[PDB]
Design a protein around this nucleic acid. Structure first.
Length: 409
DNA sequence: CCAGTCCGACCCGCATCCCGGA
DNA sequence: TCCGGGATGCGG
DNA sequence: GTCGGACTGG
């Protein structure tokens, strides 16, 4: 009875949600299937209706998933072991099996996003290269364009069938609030083609990313953010080269100067790498996150399947700091269960976890296996851990987007 | 052989909801 | 009541 | 956002 509350089939005591079908960049169709099974004493057992109100002794709920290209190899993830419910001491308490279906249903709903194959939402183009400009950027018919990179939130604007303006995010989530932007967008769409997409950045200079992201994600906001547009495209002309999209975007902002919150990102032409680098250093002096380099011939490649376009480059400083190692832990789900994770402490006694980079999962599995608090206290506790990150948390000092690259000695 | 794709884990910060005890 | 903690799901 | 790993497409 209860398995009918979730979509999918139930066979062999294994509940499989209906496949999510999508198109790859090569054109082949792909299928994504997430399943739930319960294992007690190393064997699969049926999923009873009572398994939603009372745990079974020695029973673990396992979430796994299948992905394959049409007529291709079938890739199955490691098991996500759900060993206990959540809110275990409240009226909200869920069961081992019930919580695993909530987790699996949550994955199922969100996985349908950013997939090729709507509401007209097209995922924004993503950047592949980081602090590297391919030489082919300067071996084209036109010189690449350098723009400022702003440390805010990604957004794409378009106009639905009705007069409403649609502002959505990297993962095709509709933004709420932001009425100062939408009203000026509604006025700008009176002067231009009503099927263009305005691709840009929600941002307010000298405000931290954390505040910007808070205002964009909250249902309401102080209506103080700006929309800096750096690209445009049409759904039926995605192959339009970058320089052409920039030229048409310039003509779009030549249709209305009465804009207070919507601005076109300035375009700089560079003949070589050094001029792009000089603009990067200048932008960092002005307080910006860095520079974006756009190949003049690149089409607009949406972020389907989180695709990163090879025709874009991200010039942004990579920060390296040192932090005292104080503990260690592991991941909890799938391939990261039993995989080592570091724990560092800041001067202000605040702690944070860092995922190790340049290590194999074999190394991570082994490290967490050989070690216990006794041997950790003898050696690794107290050492300096080299951490690559992008910025410091302004309220805590914690390095953000951090990854551990190794120790000093 | 070798990039190109794609998936599936993880990080911190914020926003929002349900709780349930000072 | 009202301020937390837990859980979830966004952003980077 | 970051990353490793496995498959893809030659």
């Amino acid at each position: 009875s209860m398995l009918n509350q979730f979509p999918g089939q139930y066979s062999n005591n294994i509940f499989c949600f209906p496949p999510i079908e999508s198109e790859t960049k090569s054109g082949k169709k792909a299928s994504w299937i997430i399943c739930v099974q319960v294992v007690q004493h190393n064997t699969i057992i049926p999923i009873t209706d009572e398994m939603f109100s009372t745990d079974v002794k020695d029973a673990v709920a396992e979430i796994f998933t299948k992905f394959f290209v049409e007529e291709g190899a079938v890739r199955i993830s490691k098991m996500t072991r759900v060993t206990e419910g959540k809110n275990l001491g409240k009226k909200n308490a869920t069961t081992v099996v019930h919580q695993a279906f909530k987790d699996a249903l949550s994955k199922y709903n969100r996985h349908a996003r950013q997939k090729r194959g709507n509401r007209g939402m097209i995922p924004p183009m993503l950047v592949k290269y980081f602090n590297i400009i391919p030489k082919t950027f300067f071996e084209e018919e036109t010189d690449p364009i350098v723009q400022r990179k702003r440390n805010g939130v990604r957004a794409v604007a378009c106009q639905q069938g009705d007069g409403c303006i649609l502002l959505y995010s990297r993962t095709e989530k509709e933004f709420l609030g932001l009425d100062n932007i939408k009203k000026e967008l509604k006025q700008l769409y009176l002067f231009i083609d009503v099927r263009v997409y305005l691709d840009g950045e929600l941002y307010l200079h000298r405000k931290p990313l954390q505040w910007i992201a808070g205002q964009a994600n909250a249902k309401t906001d102080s209506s103080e953010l700006h929309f800096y547009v750096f690209d445009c495209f049409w759904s039926d002309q995605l192959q339009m080269p970058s320089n052409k999209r920039q030229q048409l975007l310039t003509n779009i902002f030549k249709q209305k100067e009465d804009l207070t919150f919507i601005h076109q990102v300035e375009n700089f032409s560079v003949k070589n790498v050094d001029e792009a680098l000089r603009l990067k250093a200048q932008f960092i002096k002005e307080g910006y996150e860095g520079a974006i380099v756009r190949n003049a011939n690149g089409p607009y490649e949406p972020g389907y399947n989180n695709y990163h376009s090879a025709h874009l480059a991200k010039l942004k400083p990579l920060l390296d700091a040192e932090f005292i190692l104080v503990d260690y832990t592991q991941g909890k789900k799938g391939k990261d269960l039993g995989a080592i994770l570091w724990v560092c402490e800041l001067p202000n006694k605040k702690r944070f976890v860092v995922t190790p980079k340049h290590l194999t999962y074999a190394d991570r599995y082994a490290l967490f296996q050989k070690l216990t608090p006794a041997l950790f206290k003898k050696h690794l506790y107290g050492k300096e851990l080299t951490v690559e990150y992008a910025e410091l948390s302004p309220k805590t000092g914690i390095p953000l987007q951090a990854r551990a690259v190794g120790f000093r000695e």
